[PDB]
Design a protein around this nucleic acid. Structure first.
Ligand code: SAH
Ligand code: CL
Ligand code: CL
Ligand code: CL
Ligand code: CL
Ligand code: ZN
Ligand code: ZN
Lengths: 124, 299
RNA sequence: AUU
């Protein structure tokens, strides 16, 4: 009867959006890496892949679930950020945690949807 | 030298290791000055980047499926900036374990929380990094004596768990040091004390042991060697510099595919020691890596 | 030591 426990789902992702909507201070101390900024620009990579419009951060430090020490909702409870590097557009690098929560990666090109993915797009 | 500012840091010149200096107070002309760090870069991302840039110039053994353990990886902010740099530096697939007395979240493959003395493993390691510092070291109560605490654990861990050919980088300061650790530097083909340019205003240095031989090639008196280290820091002023942080194109550790082989202390002849000394061989088994942290149970 |  673990449904009574799950039925009461503690939505931390939605709670963070409300906290920011209430003028809350974004989570700090996301670990920004030094890199060439000549990378592929993909969202989540084994090594920093920031291009000139992005900052690369240690993944675990940008994961709400890792930082708040709460279960991951991802399949089998695995983290998609821990042990990897997340590229965040420079315009949103002030809140990497909120960016990874509000955005999703394209399974085809590996780019963020709305910030690099051009799959939904002539003269050769 | 004006040339020091263009490097990631400064290694202690060999002539200092051969002196017999008296221990004195460490007095840096720029003590406590802040480095000008690139925008949004934490002190320890800058510091570990310079340590890794310097380790790139040494004969580190780099086998496929390398094993690295990082002690003192946690910070007062609950994240592990040093571990993130090590993971960026090390070859993809390197097994990286980190540990700290206090809770933190990291990019390591496994993290152990608790005193390093509670950490166990029957496996050998290729590289040991320690950034441990005991907060009580800031309360100078008994002169500048050799310290115990985690240093006794790291000396035992190096002698029991470091693969022959393996290397170490152990953080020391004017007051955070151990005589047995300096003596153990004589068990490597080569060693030095390295100061990062972003922390030139600190007595901090990394004692780097390159290519573990498992036997003393040079007898070192630890009390005298720490005095020689402080004499170097007192007479060679190092200016703060963040210059090396701006060129990252050659940062990742080169994949050498260093040979790994299993040998008994009876087969370690002079030809094998010659390969170990050149960074061309790692001696250990390739069994699965198993680690544990002892938990004290109280009623 | 965690500028
Ligand atoms: N006996 C011990 N066992 C394990 N960790 C210890 C220890 N004594 C001190 N430490 C740890 O040593 C660290 C020194 S500061 C380390 C900063 C870290 N390298 C970074 O990247 O920011 C502290 O986190 C402290 O908890
Ligand atoms: Cl200052
Ligand atoms: Cl643990
Ligand atoms: Cl002590
Ligand atoms: Cl073998
Ligand atoms: Zn996570
Ligand atoms: Zn796409």
């Amino acid at each position: 009867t673990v449904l009574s426990f799950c039925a009461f789902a503690v939505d931390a992702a939605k709670a963070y959006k409300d906290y920011l909507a209430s003028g809350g201070q974004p989570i700090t101390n996301c670990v920004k890496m030094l890199c060439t900024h000549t990378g592929t620009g993909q969202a989540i990579t084994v090594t920093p892949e920031a291009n000139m419009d992005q900052e690369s951060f240690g993944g675990a430090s940008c994961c709400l679930y890792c930082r708040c020490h709460i279960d991951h909702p991802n399949p089998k409870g695995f983290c998609d950020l821990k042990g990897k590097y997340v590229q965040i557009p420079t315009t949103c690098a002030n809140d990497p945690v909120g960016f990874t929560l509000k955005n999703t990666v394209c399974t085809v090109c590996g780019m963020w949807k709305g910030y690099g993915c051009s799959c939904d797009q002539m003269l050769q | 030298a004006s040339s020091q500012a263009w490097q990631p840091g400064v290694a202690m010149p060999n002539l200092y290791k051969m002196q017999r200096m008296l221990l004195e107070k460490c007095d840096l002309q720029n003590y406590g000055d802040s480095a000008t760090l690139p925008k949004g870069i934490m002190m320890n991302v800058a510091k570990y980047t310079q340590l890794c840039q310097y380790l790139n110039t040494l004969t580190l053994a780099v086998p496929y499926n390398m094993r690295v353990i990082h002690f003192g990886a946690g910070s007062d902010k609950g994240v592990a900036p040093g571990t993130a740099v090590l993971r960026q530096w090390l070859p993809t697939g390197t097994l990286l374990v980190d540990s700290d007395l206090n809770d933190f979240v990291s990019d390591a493959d496994s993290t152990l929380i608790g005193d390093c003395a509670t950490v166990h493993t029957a496996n050998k390691w290729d590289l040991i990094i320690s950034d441990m510092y005991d907060p009580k070291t800031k309360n100078v109560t008994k002169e500048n004596d050799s310290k115990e605490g985690f240093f006794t654990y790291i000396c035992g861990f190096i002698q029991q768990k470091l693969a022959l050919g393996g290397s170490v980088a152990i953080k020391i300061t004017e007051h955070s040091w151990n005589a047995d650790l300096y003596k153990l530097m004589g068990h490597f083909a080569w060693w030095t004390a390295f100061v990062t340019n972003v922390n030139a205003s600190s007595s901090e240095a990394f004692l780097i042991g390159c290519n573990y031989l498992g036997k003393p090639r040079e007898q070192i008196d630890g009390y005298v060697m720490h005095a020689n280290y402080i004499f170097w820091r007192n007479t060679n002023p190092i200016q703060l510099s963040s210059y090396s942080l701006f060129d990252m194109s050659k940062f990742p550790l080169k994949l050498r595919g260093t040979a790994v082989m299993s040998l008994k202390e009876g087969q370690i002849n002079d030809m094998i020691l010659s390969l170990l000394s050149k960074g061309r061989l790692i001696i250990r088994e390739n069994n699965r890596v198993v680690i544990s942290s002892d938990v004290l149970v109280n009623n």
